[PDB]
Amino acid sequence: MKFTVEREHLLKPLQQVSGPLGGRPTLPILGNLLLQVADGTLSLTGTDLEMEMVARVALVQPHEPGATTVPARKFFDICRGLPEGAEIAVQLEGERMLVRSGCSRFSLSTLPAADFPNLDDWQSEVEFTLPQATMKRLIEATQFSMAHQDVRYYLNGMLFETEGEELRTVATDGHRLAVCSMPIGQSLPSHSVIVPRKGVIELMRMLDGGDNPLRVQIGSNNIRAHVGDFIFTSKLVDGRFPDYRRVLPKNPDKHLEAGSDLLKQAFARAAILSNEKFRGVRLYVSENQLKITANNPEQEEAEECLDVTYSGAEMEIGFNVSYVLDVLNALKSENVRMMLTDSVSSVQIEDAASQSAAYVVMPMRL
Template sequence: MIITCSREQLLEAVLNVQRAVSSKSSIPALQGILLKAKQNSIFLCGYDAEMLGMTTEIEAEVTQTGTIVLSAKLFGDIVRRLPDERVHMETDDKNMTTIRSGQSNFSIVGIPAEEYPELPTVSGERGIRISNLVLKNMIHQTIFAVAESDAKPIHTGTLFEIGSGKIRLVSVDGYRLAMREEMVNSDEQGLSFVVPGKALQEVSKLLPENDENCELQIGSRHILFIVGRYTVIARLLEGEFLDYRSAIPQKSSSTVILKTSEFISSVERVSLLITDRLKSPIRCIFDEDTVRLSSYTPIGRASDQFPAKLVGNPVEMGFNNHYLLDALRNAEGDQIKLELNGSLSPMKVLPMEGNSFLFLVLPVRLKSEAG
């Protein structure tokens, strides 16, 4: 393999692709990036052989085609520090790879490409196209509620439902639920699958904030995201996802209209006394024209309030401050609507109009404050 390419393009590709590389693997090749010199381009691939794979191609002047696997960390460190705008690479028949740029010259030992596992393939028979910006926002507004523990592995991913011209994403972790819905130009019906949160985080990083489309190709066990020059392949999670529809309260006895920014600022203020060591719920009293918040820990008390409009019965509830803030910070719009059904039923966070998002935050049982 003999190639010359742009250092900037190579660095961007290596830094992205290496995020899919396995940091610990019994197969040495999986700790590397596969490079494949084609006619006018170089193909790069990172793969952890379990959950995630990422590939891309960049332009290159290819004098001799060939393949090699190079240590992802070492190769990335070298490319990051190369001094010149152009990079020249040569690999000999003993897998020794020379990397030259300006006055810098490295020779590193590679691994034969034959030792690199093949990526799974996706037939692409089923799929949709969706705006980069829309998908990026949908992931951002649901991924915070993905479960971090693998007590129920299926909940470490986000449920995708596609049908009737809509796409819906749902994440749950036992304490909260996040749902986001958008119209999509697709004839697909009854498509339902769960994508690992780790894969969605990587897809989100690749998605540019523009109205161009990315493509999702769905197979029986894997999904392929095509974002510009990048493809991300992920293994779909298996199992029974929570019946989220039955978890969403259908009735409410109180509706609160308030300014999102005021609620966030108030929660942030009364959270100042709460730490990982000194945990305490935030007490929220939703009254006729005011929301009153307070917290109490061994180091002191805090209270705050802001105006709001209540229709229905006053309600007093307790919340984990982090879960409450996650929902509020991911809500769109200057104002939001809260639907409540007593102190122990989940709180629904909704947009003022439509149903583009729905967040559920489970309450915490409050104890009477000491002294």
């Protein structure tokens, strides 16, 4: 196996395929990248057994077929450490991989390509394409609401749902929920899958928002995303995900609109004097007026008053201010709308200008 490529044709591929890796995998070959030269293509693959990233780079310079695996970190550091525009010549020689560039020479230990974990083939059941920027928005809008290491393993991930011609993401940790929907101009079957948290993050980081459209293939137990020269595959999470339709408040009859920044900064200050563990704040609403209060076990107190647009009856409600801040931070709109019902019901929050994304936060007794 032999190839010569320009540094800059190798760096991003190396970075992408290293994604699924960790510093020190127990099974050592998982710390390595699979390199394959076939025809006019160099393929690079990294895996953690649950998901895999593949990158293909065209070989315009002389090359010879073959395969081996090399330490990902070392090989990436070498390439990144070389000067901009450097030509990187690689040859397999025994069980060492030789790397030459300019007046620099490196000899890396290898592990047999034959030892590299091969993810089973599977069949695509549902397929569609959409702009990268769209997928990116769908994930960004909801990702923060995913559970982390919950015993409810099905919550440590994101629901990807197809219905009509919409793709929809849903994330919840059992306390707060995020949903975002985008039309993608194709008739789809109704289908739902749970992508694991680490897979969601990997997919997110593979998208640069560019001109290459994202092609998605969903099987019964896997999902694959193809964009440009990168191919990402992840296993799916089993289990039944909550129904976001059941969580959305029914006919909220109270509507608040306010500047997003002003509102966020008020909650952020009030949070300072909220209980450090439970983060409870109170919201008082009345005609065109909003008051936020916070206190803590030290009997310190914060009060924020704000001019808003509010029509319905007066009410107060408590909730976890971190959940509200997460929402306001994710919105990235100028104006925010909150739909309320009463003090024992959830609140729905959205960008005032779009219903694409919706957020649900529970009430909390303070």
